[PDB]
Amino acid sequence: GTILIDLSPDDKEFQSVEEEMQSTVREHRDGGHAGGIFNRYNILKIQKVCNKKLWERYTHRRKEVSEENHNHANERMLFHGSPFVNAIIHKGFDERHAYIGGMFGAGIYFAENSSKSNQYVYGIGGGTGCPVHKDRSCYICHRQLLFCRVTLGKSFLQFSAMMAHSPPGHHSVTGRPSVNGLALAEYVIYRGEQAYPEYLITYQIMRPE
């Protein structure tokens, strides 16, 4: 039931999604090992992901969370990178898309930094890199990220040196950076219904000059 609608580069929606992608790139403590060496992206395409059933699954859960949190869904727009992006857009997020080994337990992880999610496009730690060249810093191969609508509800704050259940009385976990002053927050949900994959972004990382 999923259809993908291309956005024009002239459309304000394309431009605002591109700006979030580009402006949330940072340097990583791995020197580029997982995601590659780059300061910016070449955006090739942005598509709106449209699936009625999956949207209604998201909004149903959003109202449940809202009603448990003084009518406040605490909804964010966050990046997700995964080898399973094609399954996600067709079937929705579920337990199969969890990062079993993540620092906040087996859940589905989202980033404010697009460059954090980029580290996961080819697997955990960047896997072995792109399938064609086996290069984690490949500047040729096309990559894909999701920019997703995520319900956080009441989020458990984990101060952090950088499927399970949410902590009792909470709907998500927030990983607050406590060492790297430039890192933005990461978030974990434990129910696939608490995210909708709204934009599919196709891109290349760009080699710095």
Could you list the residues known to form a binding site for Zn(2+), using ranges.
130, 133, 138, 141
Q: Which is nearer to Zn ion, 44 or 157 (CB)?
A: 44
Q: Which stretch binds Zn ion (CB under 5 A): 8-16, 64-72, 94-102, 137-145?
A: 137-145
Distances (CA, A) of 76 to 6, 101, 110, 146, 186: 23, 24, 10, 13, 11
- List the one residue out of 76, 77, 75 whose CA is nearest residue 62: 75
Q: Which is nearer to ligand 5WW, 109 or 190 (CB)?
A: 109
Give the start-end residues of each E strand in 60-142: 75-80, 108-111
Retrieve residue 123's tokens: 């697997």
By CB under 6 A, the residues from 42 to 81 that bind ligand 5WW are 79-81
The helix/strand/coil state of 172 is strand
Retrieve residue 144's tokens: 């894909």
Question: Is the Cβ–Cβ distance between 196 and 149 less than 8 Å?
Answer: yes
133 binds, among Zn ion, ligand 5WW, none (CB under 5 to 8 A by kind): Zn ion
Q: Which is nearer to ligand 5WW, 63 or 142 (CB)?
A: 142
Q: Please state the residue numbers annotated as binding site.
A: 130, 133, 138, 141
Q: Residues in the site for ligand 5WW, rule: CB under 6 A?
A: 79-83, 99, 102, 109-111, 116-117, 120, 123-124, 186
